[PDB]
Design a protein around this nucleic acid. Structure first.
Ligand SMILES: [Mg+2]
Ligand SMILES: [Mg+2]
Ligand SMILES: [Mg+2]
Ligand SMILES: [Mg+2]
Ligand SMILES: [Mg+2]
Ligand SMILES: [Mg+2]
Ligand SMILES: [Mg+2]
Ligand SMILES: [Mg+2]
Ligand SMILES: [Mg+2]
Ligand SMILES: [Mg+2]
Ligand SMILES: [Mg+2]
Ligand SMILES: [Mg+2]
Ligand SMILES: [Mg+2]
Ligand SMILES: [Mg+2]
Ligand SMILES: [Mg+2]
Ligand SMILES: [Mg+2]
Ligand SMILES: [Mg+2]
Ligand SMILES: [Mg+2]
Ligand SMILES: [Mg+2]
Ligand SMILES: [Mg+2]
Ligand SMILES: [Mg+2]
Ligand SMILES: [Mg+2]
Ligand SMILES: [Mg+2]
Ligand SMILES: [Mg+2]
Ligand SMILES: [Mg+2]
Ligand SMILES: [Mg+2]
Ligand SMILES: [Mg+2]
Ligand SMILES: [Mg+2]
Ligand SMILES: [Mg+2]
Ligand SMILES: [Mg+2]
Ligand SMILES: [Mg+2]
Ligand SMILES: [Mg+2]
Ligand SMILES: [Mg+2]
Ligand SMILES: [Mg+2]
Ligand SMILES: [Mg+2]
Ligand SMILES: [Mg+2]
Ligand SMILES: [Mg+2]
Ligand SMILES: [Mg+2]
Ligand SMILES: [Mg+2]
Ligand SMILES: [Mg+2]
Ligand SMILES: [Mg+2]
Ligand SMILES: [Mg+2]
Ligand SMILES: [Mg+2]
Ligand SMILES: [Mg+2]
Ligand SMILES: [Mg+2]
Ligand SMILES: [Mg+2]
Ligand SMILES: [Mg+2]
Ligand SMILES: [Mg+2]
Ligand SMILES: [Mg+2]
Ligand SMILES: [Mg+2]
Ligand SMILES: [Mg+2]
Ligand SMILES: [Mg+2]
Ligand SMILES: [Mg+2]
Ligand SMILES: [Mg+2]
Ligand SMILES: [Mg+2]
Ligand SMILES: [Mg+2]
Ligand SMILES: [Mg+2]
Ligand SMILES: [Mg+2]
Ligand SMILES: [Mg+2]
Ligand SMILES: [Mg+2]
Ligand SMILES: [Mg+2]
Ligand SMILES: [Mg+2]
Ligand SMILES: [Mg+2]
Ligand SMILES: [Mg+2]
Ligand SMILES: [Mg+2]
Ligand SMILES: [Mg+2]
Ligand SMILES: [Mg+2]
Ligand SMILES: [Mg+2]
Ligand SMILES: [Mg+2]
Ligand SMILES: [Mg+2]
Ligand SMILES: [Mg+2]
Ligand SMILES: [Mg+2]
Ligand SMILES: [Mg+2]
Lengths: 189, 110, 141, 84
RNA sequence: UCCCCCGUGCCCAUAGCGGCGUGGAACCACCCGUUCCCAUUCCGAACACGGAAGUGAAACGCGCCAGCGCCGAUGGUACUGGGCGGGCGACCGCCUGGGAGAGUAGGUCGGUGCGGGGGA
RNA sequence: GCACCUCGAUGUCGGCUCGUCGCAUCCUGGGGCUGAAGAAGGUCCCAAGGGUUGGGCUGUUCGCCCAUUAAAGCGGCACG
RNA sequence: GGUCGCCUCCUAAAAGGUAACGGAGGCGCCCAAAGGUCCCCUCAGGCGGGACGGAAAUCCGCCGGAGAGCGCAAGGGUAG
RNA sequence: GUAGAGCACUGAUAGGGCUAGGGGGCCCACCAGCCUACCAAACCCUGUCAAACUCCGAAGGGUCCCAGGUGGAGCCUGGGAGUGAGGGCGCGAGCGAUAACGUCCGCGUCCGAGCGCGGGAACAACCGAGACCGCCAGCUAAGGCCCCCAAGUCUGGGCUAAGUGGUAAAGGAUGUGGCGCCGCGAAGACAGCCAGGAGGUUGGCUUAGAAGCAGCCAUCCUUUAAAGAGUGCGUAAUAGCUCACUGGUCGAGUGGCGCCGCGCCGAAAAUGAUCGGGGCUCAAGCCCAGCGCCGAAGCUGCGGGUCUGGGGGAUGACCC
C-alpha cells in the first residue's frame, strides 16, 4: 500500500553532528520546490527497504503539508554501506518517470531442467502519472529456456505506464550453472 | 562541417583581419555588387558604398567599377586612407577586381 | 587464472591504497555478496581458490559473479639478488580492492547454501570480510 | 657470496628539461620584445601585439600589460594592451 | 525607436544533430547562357562572366517542437591548505578553512553590436 | 638483503677439552583419541630431572655403513 | 655484465625544477623540393553501389570536427 | 592538471544482449538453409581498472599589481670564508617484499652545531622548550600527582576479572556488560519429569534368515484429541522399543540472528627474573567528565654584565 514517515526541517546544522544524532540529512526538491531536510535514519530504514524507489512515500513536515515523495538518489557511505543522504522528489501531476518492480512469475523451463535465470533488471523505467504506481509488473517467464532471453519490447505494461527505457534493453535471462565437471577443463588450461 | 566557400572566407579574411588596417568587406551578388569598410577592432562600419543604395545599372563590372569611386570619395571625406581589401571567397578578377582599381581612382591607398 | 589477455605496459608501479573503493560497493547481479573490510591486493591465485571453493559447494548448479579483475602486475626480484640492476620481473597478477568493493556474488542458490558458500570463499582471502544481501539501497544505486 | 646474472635495464635514458610554459602573466607590465609564453604548439594563440616565433614562442610586440582571453572553441589567446 | 532583409562582427554548442513548417514584390539563392575576361590533373561542378525566363525544390532565412548532443544546480560526499589524536602496520578518526567529479532536479531548437537596403 | 660498531686487526672450518642453556621431547615419567582385543604401534597433550654407545670411510660438519641401544633428540651460547 | 652525448614521455606531489644499475622509446639523419610565396583545395573510416577488381587498386552515393595526415620516436599542437 | 573522480579518447575488463567468419551436427552444401548450454570481432546494456588514459577537476601552489610588515629584513659593490660523506622523524612517490636503524628524490622539521635543560626507566634527532650571569623567590609546559619520587590513596558516572592492563595476526568461544531485530510464549512456550510413540511399515528390497536403518526409485496410503518405503541404540539377522511427533504436568518467560564496549583462546627460545621497580583489582587498570596541585636553564619577580638602537647629554665619560 502507500507509505509515510516523519521529516523535520534543517537550515543546515552540522550534517556530521546530525547524522551521528540518530538521524539522516537529505533534501526535498522538485521543479518548483527545493528544501533542506532530515528524516530519522532508523525510521527511514524501517520505511525504505519495502518502499525504495518504486512505491510512493509521503513526507509529514513539521508544518504539516504532506507532499508525495519518491527517491531520486540515495547516498551510500561506501566504506560502511549505510545511507548519509536522500534526494526527495515531490510529485506534481506529471508523467515524471520512475522504475517499477518487474514480476518474473512462473519459474522458467530453463531452470528446473538446467540452471537458473538472471534478474538483469529487477525493475523497469517508465513514464506514468503519480496515480498509476504499479505494485507489480507481472511478466511471464516460464517459457524462457537455457541460453535464452527477452527484452523490454516484451512487457505487459498496464495503461498509461508505457515504457521509458528502450525496446532493445534486456530484462532477464537463464544462464548455465557452475558445474564442477566444468572445473576440470577450466584450470586444466 | 564547413563549405569550400566557408573555409576560403576565413582563410583570406583572417590573413587581413590581423593586419590592423581598415578592412573593406566586399560582397558579390549575381544581381549587383557592394562593399563596406569595417574597423574590426571595435566592429563598427566606417562607410558603405553599394549598388542597391546607389541603385545603378549597366554592366556588372562597370557598376562594380563605379561603386568603388563612390567609396573612394565618400570614405576620403572621413579621412580614411588605410585600406585593406577583404576580397571574400571571390577572387581578384573582373567583378570585385574592378571595384578595387575603382576605389584606387579616388585616392584610397591599397 | 585471471591474467590480462593483452597488456599496454609491462611492469607497473605499486601505489598505496588509501581509502574506500571507487565503485561496486553495492551488489548488482547476484542475490548475496562478499565484500572487503580491509584493503589489499588480491592474487589471481587467491581469487581462483575462492571461485573453485564455491563452485564445489553447490556442485552442479548455481551461478557465480566475480566483480574484481587482477589487472595489476605484481613484480618481484628473483631469488637472492641485491638491489638495483632494474626492476623485478613480473611474478604474479593482482587486483586492487579497497573497503566496500564487492567481490563475489551468487544467484540460483539457497539461503545458507550461499552463506556457507560465500563463507568459505571468505576464508581463502587475506582479509576480513562481510557478507551482505542485495537491498533497495543497491536498487537505488 | 653476492651478485649473479644481473639484468641490465634497456632504458634509464631521459630528455633535458625544456623549462617551458607561461613566463608572463595577465596584468603584468611588459615592454616590447619580452617573451610571454614558451610552448610547443599554440596552447596559446597570438593576440593583438603578440607575435609567434619559429617554435611557437609568444613574444610581446609593444609595451603595457599582458592580458589573457579564453575564446572557448576558438582558442586561448594572449594580447598585450599598450601603455596609457 | 518597431519589424523583415542583406552584408557582418561578438558570447562560445543553452548556439548544435535531426524531423516538422513557412518565406520570393523586396534582398539572397538556385536558375539562363558560353560570346567576352577567367576557368577544370576530365566537367562552366567549382572559379569566372554576360544576363533575369523560371523558382523557393536545394541551400540559406525566420520559426516550431527536447528523440539525440549540449549545458545543468541545491543537498551530501570524496579529497584537502592548516591544527590534533589514532593504530605493528596496511591505514583510520576529530578540528578549522576550502570543497569537487559522477549523478539528481531542471535548462536548451540560440544571444547580440555596427552599417546598409526595404515596411509603417 | 642492508652496510650500523669493529680494517692504528673481533684468528677462519673441522676435531679435542670443558660445558651450560632452550624445548619445537629421541629415551624413560604421565596422560587423551585410536581405524586401541592383547602385545606392539599410531597421532596429539604434559613434562628439561637425568640420560642420549662403540667403530669403518672421509680434513670434514653432514652423511653412508657395521655392531649395539632405553634412546642413540635437534638447537642457542662470536654457526660457545 | 650494463651504462656514458642528444630528444620524447612517465616517475615529477596541477608553476619551474627534482633522484635511483626507476618504467617505456628514439637521435648521430633527411628534403632543390619536403623549401619561399600566391592561388586553390579537404581526411581516416563506415554503409549502400559498381566489368576485370579483391576485407583494401580506381569511379559513384549518403553519413565524419578530426580518431587521417603533418619525412622518421614520443608528447603538445593542428583541417578558420 | 595533482588528490579526487570519470571511461568521452588510449588500453584493460566481468557478465549479459546482439551479431561476422571460425566450431559443428541438420545438409551430409556440388551451394543454400546454418540451430547453438561452442570460440567469440565490431556493437549494445550492466559493472569496472590504469604513473606513462582524460569529458572533468579541488585544496593549493606559482607570478605580477596593490596594502600591512623596521626586521641580526631586503637590495647593489667589494674583502674573507667554510661547505660540496649528511642523518632521523612527519608527509608525498619511485626501487625493495604495500621487508630492513634499507635505499633514492620532493616538502618540512629537528640533530648536525642545542650529546645544554624537562619529560620519555635509561637513549643525537618523540613530546615540551632556544641555556648572558646570579637567587634557600613565584606561574606554568610536556608528563605527572600510592611508595622509591615532587605533587590527589582527589571527585562523580561506567566498563574489565585477565595482572588484560604490562606487546602480536588469520580465525575461534552460551566471557561479562550493553544495544537492536525476529521467532515460540496462558490459540499454556523452552527445559525435564513421558498413557501414547496405530495402518494393505504385508519395505519398492530373493540367495549362509535381510518381516524399520550398505539392499541404489510415486524417499507408499494411516484414527490424524497423536507419526517415520525410518533421526534411532537392535543398525545383512526374534528380544529390547529413543527420538523427530502428540497429550498431560509444569506456570513465565525462552530460542535465534545482529551490532557496540572491554576481556579469553590462538601464544614455543635459548646466562636470572621483571610493567623502571615495589606493588596495584568499585584501581595505583580502561573510557567519560570536573577540579586542585607537582613539575624545565620557557615566563615572571630582584641584582648584575654586555652589545645594539634610544634619549639624556641640548659632550666623549656618565645617566635612565
Ligand atoms: Mg553548503
Ligand atoms: Mg547466450
Ligand atoms: Mg537461441
Ligand atoms: Mg662468503
Ligand atoms: Mg621530459
Ligand atoms: Mg554574414
Ligand atoms: Mg517546403
Ligand atoms: Mg514569378
Ligand atoms: Mg518542399
Ligand atoms: Mg539548416
Ligand atoms: Mg526575424
Ligand atoms: Mg529576429
Ligand atoms: Mg520575432
Ligand atoms: Mg525569437
Ligand atoms: Mg513542447
Ligand atoms: Mg523540454
Ligand atoms: Mg518535453
Ligand atoms: Mg553534471
Ligand atoms: Mg599537515
Ligand atoms: Mg600521525
Ligand atoms: Mg560542496
Ligand atoms: Mg571537510
Ligand atoms: Mg528603418
Ligand atoms: Mg515610405
Ligand atoms: Mg673426529
Ligand atoms: Mg658439544
Ligand atoms: Mg614448555
Ligand atoms: Mg609435534
Ligand atoms: Mg608415553
Ligand atoms: Mg664414536
Ligand atoms: Mg650418531
Ligand atoms: Mg651464521
Ligand atoms: Mg653459517
Ligand atoms: Mg647448527
Ligand atoms: Mg665493462
Ligand atoms: Mg623562472
Ligand atoms: Mg646524475
Ligand atoms: Mg560499420
Ligand atoms: Mg562494398
Ligand atoms: Mg563490382
Ligand atoms: Mg562484384
Ligand atoms: Mg569496393
Ligand atoms: Mg609521426
Ligand atoms: Mg601526456
Ligand atoms: Mg593524444
Ligand atoms: Mg565480455
Ligand atoms: Mg562483452
Ligand atoms: Mg563468457
Ligand atoms: Mg543471430
Ligand atoms: Mg593520473
Ligand atoms: Mg563541470
Ligand atoms: Mg572549484
Ligand atoms: Mg637594518
Ligand atoms: Mg658599485
Ligand atoms: Mg666600486
Ligand atoms: Mg663591478
Ligand atoms: Mg663531490
Ligand atoms: Mg660534521
Ligand atoms: Mg651531540
Ligand atoms: Mg648519551
Ligand atoms: Mg632529553
Ligand atoms: Mg636533544
Ligand atoms: Mg599519600
Ligand atoms: Mg552505563
Ligand atoms: Mg559464536
Ligand atoms: Mg484462543
Ligand atoms: Mg531400509
Ligand atoms: Mg520391534
Ligand atoms: Mg537465547
Ligand atoms: Mg610502576
Ligand atoms: Mg569510580
Ligand atoms: Mg644595563
Ligand atoms: Mg662629541
Amino acid at each position: 500500500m502507500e507509505y509515510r514517515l516523519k521529516a523535520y526541517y534543517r537550515e543546515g546544522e552540522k550534517p556530521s553532528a546530525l547524522r551521528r544524532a540518530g538521524k539522516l540529512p537529505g533534501v526535498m526538491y522538485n521543479r518548483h520546490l527545493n528544501r533542506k531536510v532530515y528524516v530519522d535514519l532508523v525510521e527511514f530504514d524501517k520505511v525504505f527497504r519495502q518502499a525504495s524507489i518504486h512505491h510512493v512515500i509521503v513526507l509529514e513536515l513539521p508544518d504539516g503539508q504532506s507532499l508525495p515523495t519518491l527517491v531520486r538518489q540515495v547516498n551510500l557511505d561506501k566504506r560502511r554501506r549505510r545511507p548519509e543522504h536522500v534526494d526527495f522528489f515531490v510529485l506534481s501531476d506529471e508523467p515524471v518517470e520512475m522504475y517499477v518492480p518487474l514480476r518474473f512469475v512462473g519459474t522458467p523451463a530453463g531452470v528446473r531442467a538446467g540452471g537458473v535465470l538472471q534478474e538483469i533488471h529487477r525493475d523497469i523505467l517508465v513514464k506514468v502519472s503519480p496515480r498509476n504506481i504499479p505494485e507489480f509488473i507481472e511478466v511471464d517467464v516460464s517459457g524462457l529456456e537455457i541460453g535464452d532471453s527477452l527484452h523490454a519490447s516484451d512487457l505487459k505494461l498496464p495503461p498509461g505506464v508505457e515504457l521509458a527505457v528502450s525496446p532493445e534493453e534486456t530484462i532477464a535471462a537463464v544462464v548455465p550453472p557452475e558445474d564442477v565437471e566444468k572445473l576440470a577443463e577450466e584450470a586444466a588450461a | 562541417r564547413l563549405t569550400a566557400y566557408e573555409r576560403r572566407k576565413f582563410r583570406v579574411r583572417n590573413r587581413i583581419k590581423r593586419t590592423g588596417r581598415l578592412r573593406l568587406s566586399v560582397f558579390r551578388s549575381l544581381k549587383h555588387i557592394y562593399a563596406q569598410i569595417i574597423d574590426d577592432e571595435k566592429g563598427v562600419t566606417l562607410v558603405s558604398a553599394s549598388s542597391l543604395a546607389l541603385k545603378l545599372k549597366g554592366n556588372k563590372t562597370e557598376v562594380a567599377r563605379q561603386v568603388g569611386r563612390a567609396l573612394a570619395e565618400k570614405a576620403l571625406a572621413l579621412g580614411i586612407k588605410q585600406v585593406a581589401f577583404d576580397r571574400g571567397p571571390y577572387k581578384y578578377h573582373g567583378r570585385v577586381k574592378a571595384l578595387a582599381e575603382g576605389a584606387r581612382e579616388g585616392g584610397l591607398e591599397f | 587464472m585471471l591474467m590480462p589477455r593483452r597488456m599496454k605496459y609491462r611492469k607497473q608501479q605499486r601505489g598505496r591504497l588509501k581509502g574506500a573503493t571507487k565503485g561496486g560497493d553495492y551488489v548488482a547481479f547476484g542475490d548475496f555478496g562478499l565484500v572487503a573490510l580491509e584493503p589489499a591486493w588480491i592474487t589471481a591465485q587467491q581469487i581462483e581458490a575462492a571461485r573453485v571453493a564455491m563452485v564445489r559447494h553447490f556442485r552442479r548448479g548455481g551461478k557465480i559473479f566475480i566483480r574484481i579483475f587482477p589487472d595489476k602486475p605484481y613484480t618481484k626480484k628473483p631469488l637472492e639478488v641485491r638491489m638495483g640492476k632494474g626492476k623485478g620481473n613480473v611474478e604474479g597478477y593482482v587486483a586492487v580492492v579497497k573497503p566496500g568493493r564487492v567481490m563475489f556474488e551468487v544467484a540460483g542458490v539457497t539461503e545458507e547454501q550461499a552463506m556457507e558458500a560465500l563463507r568459505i570463499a571468505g576464508h581463502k582471502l587475506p582479509i576480513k570480510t562481510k557478507i551482505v544481501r542485495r537491498d533497495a539501497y543497491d536498487e537505488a544505486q | 657470496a653476492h651478485k649473479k646474472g644481473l639484468g641490465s635495464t634497456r632504458n634509464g635514458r631521459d630528455s633535458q628539461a625544456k623549462r617551458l610554459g607561461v613566463k608572463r602573466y595577465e596584468g603584468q607590465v611588459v615592454r616590447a620584445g619580452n617573451i610571454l609564453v614558451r610552448q610547443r604548439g599554440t596552447r596559446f594563440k597570438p593576440g593583438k601585439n603578440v607575435g609567434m616565433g619559429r617554435d611557437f614562442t609568444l613574444f610581446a610586440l609593444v609595451d603595457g600589460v599582458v592580458e589573457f582571453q579564453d575564446r572557448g572553441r576558438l582558442g586561448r589567446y594572449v594580447h598585450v594592451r599598450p601603455l596609457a
